[PDB]
Amino acid sequence: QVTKVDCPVCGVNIPESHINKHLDSCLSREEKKESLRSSVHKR
């Protein structure tokens, strides 16, 4: 079955199957813009 759904993060036309991967990327950007923090200096 072929279907499409908009992204609630960025609003982009993407299939319901490729949306899962897209969410993984779309969300990654959100973590990029935000400041980076590390509990331990080593890691």
Partner: protein, 76 residues
């Protein structure tokens, strides 16, 4: 508090949950209403996902809010 959830398909479901209730708890509530496994359901608010180990109050969610529901078939 009474909140609303809107799926990508356009369907609308009104769900009653408390701020003290965890996200993982919310999914189970949905299971009964939508009949869909909690694992196969992911919620997004303001563009970011909701951590199962977090609570609604922790996300600054007030009374009557619209959440986004997405379905994750399989990761292959």
């Amino acid at each position: 508090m009474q909140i609303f959830v809107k799926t990508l398909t356009g369907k609308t479901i009104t769900l009653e949950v408390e701020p003290s209730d965890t996200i993982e708890n919310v999914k189970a509530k949905i299971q009964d209403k939508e009949g869909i496994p909690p694992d196969q359901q992911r919620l997004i608010f303001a563009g970011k996902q909701l951590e199962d180990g977090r609570t609604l109050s922790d996300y600054n969610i007030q009374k009557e809010s619209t959440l986004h529901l997405v379905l994750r078939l399989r990761g292959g």
